[PDB]
Every structure is written in structure tokens, then in C-alpha cells.
Amino acid sequence: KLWEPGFISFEDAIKRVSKIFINSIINFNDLDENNFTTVPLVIDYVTPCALCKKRSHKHPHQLSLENGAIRIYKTGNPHSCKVKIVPLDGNKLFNIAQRILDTN
Amino acid sequence: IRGNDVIFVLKTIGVPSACRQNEDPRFVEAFKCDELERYIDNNPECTLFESLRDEEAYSIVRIFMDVDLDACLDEIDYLTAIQDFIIEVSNCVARFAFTECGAIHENVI
Ligand SMILES: [Zn+2]
Numbered sequence: 001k002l003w004e005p006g007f008i009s010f011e012d013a014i015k016r017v018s019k020i021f022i023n024s025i026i027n028f029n030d031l032d033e034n035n036f037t038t039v040p041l042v043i044d045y046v047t048p049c050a051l052c053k054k055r056s057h058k059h060p061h062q063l064s065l066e067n068g069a070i071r072i073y074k075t076g077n078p079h080s081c082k083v084k085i086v087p088l089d090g091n092k093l094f095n096i097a098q099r100i101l102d103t104n
Numbered sequence: 105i106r107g108n109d110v111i112f113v114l115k116t117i118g119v120p121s122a123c124r125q126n127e128d129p130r131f132v133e134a135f136k137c138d139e140l141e142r143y144i145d146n147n148p149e150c151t152l153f154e155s156l157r158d159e160e161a162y163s164i165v166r167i168f169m170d171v172d173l174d175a176c177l178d179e180i181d182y183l184t185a186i187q188d189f190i191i192e193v194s195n196c197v198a199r200f201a202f203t204e205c206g207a208i209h210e211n212v213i
Binding site: 029030 | 118
């Protein structure tokens with residue numbers, strides 16, 4: 001089990017990460033709780049990449065789990081793409097409210 | 105392509121393609137409309153996933169929207185939201201068809 005289902009249903013997290021990727025995901029079906037940190041995410045770059053804004057990517061992206069979040073990073077040349085983060089805990093409005101109180 | 109009375113279906117999630125084009129009865133099936141209905145009534149526990157045979161020749165399908173929101177709302181909000189949503193989806197599809205597809209916005213709307 002590479003996924004800890006203590007944050008969000010794995011299907012919902014995959015739905016979020018797919019929504020981030022405007023381009024169609026090729027192997028969306030095989031992402032499960034025991035492979036999502038291993039298999040590269042091959043993407044059909046019909047549209048420009050949603051992260052690097054280029055025409056396409058030479059190498060597929062990859063997912064990592066860290067600090068209760070998903071880190072999306074490109075293989076091969078790291079600086080050629082932007083690192084992306086998907087959170088899993090907290091209503092975003094609650095984070096905003098915490099920041100606003102935080103200012104005093 | 106003008107009409108197709110038979111529907112391609114999957115039996116479960118995770119079907120490999122090599123079974124999909126080979127038409128493996130253990131994963132995929134073809135159902136005639138009346139026979140599809142008969143199978144559905146006769147199998148209340150059936151797991152069926154509608155799909156297509158070949159996108160190269162039969163990419164034309166009806167327009168369908170899916171909305172799955174984890175929030176239970178009353179009937180009034182339900183109806184006002186569904187009418188509004190169909191309004192904006194009609195506006196968007198008409199705008200795109202007029203921009204690129206060259207279709208008449210009123211016709212599609
Ligand atoms: Zn990129």
C-alpha cells in the first residue's frame with residue numbers, strides 16, 4: 001500500500017490531479033493505491049502542458065507523496081518544468097481565514 | 105455512422121486494451137438495445153460501462169455531462185441549478201461551435 005487513505009479517497013485525489021492536467025492522461029486506469037509513486041504518468045500532449053506551458057514534454061511526469069500532499073515533478077530535466085503541489089487537508093477558505101487572523 | 109443500435113460495454117474497471125480490441129467476452133461485450141435492456145432487467149447486479157468500438161470510424165456520440173458533488177441540496181436549488189447549468193453549457197457549446205465548428209449557435213442550443 002503506497003497510499004494512506006487517511007486524507008482523501010484515492011479516486012478523489014486522482015480526480016484532482018487529473019483536473020490539474022488539462023491534457024488527457026494516457027494510463028489513468030492503472031493508477032492505484034500501490035503504484036501511484038512508481039509508474040510514470042504518460043500524457044497525450046494535444047494541448048500545451050498545464051505546468052510548463054510548452055508544446056509537449058519529452059519525458060513523462062511523476063507523483064510523490066510528502067507532508068500530506070502530492071508533489072508533481074517532471075523526469076529528465078527538472079528545471080524544464082514547474083513543480084506542482086496538491087494538498088489534501090483543509091478547506092481552502094479555512095486556510096485563508098487562518099492567514100487573515102494570523103495577521104492580527 | 106448515421107445510426108448504431110448496438111452498444112459496446114465493459115464488465116469492470118481495469119480492462120486492458122489487448123482484450124478490448126480482441127473482444128474478450130470476460131471483459132467486454134456488445135449489446136443490442138432491446139437485448140441490453142433485457143440484460144439489465146435480468147441482471148440487477150450487473151456492472152456495465154458503456155464505451156465505443158473504434159474512435160477512428162465511430163467517434164460521433166451524443167453530448168453528455170456528469171456532475172458529482174458531495175453536497176446534498178434541496179429540490180429548489182437542484183432545479184434552479186440544473187436549468188442554469190444547461191443554460192451556460194448551451195452557451196459555451198454554441199460559442200465554441202460558432203468559433204471553430206462553424207455551426208449555428210441557435211441550432212445547437
Ligand atoms: Zn511540463
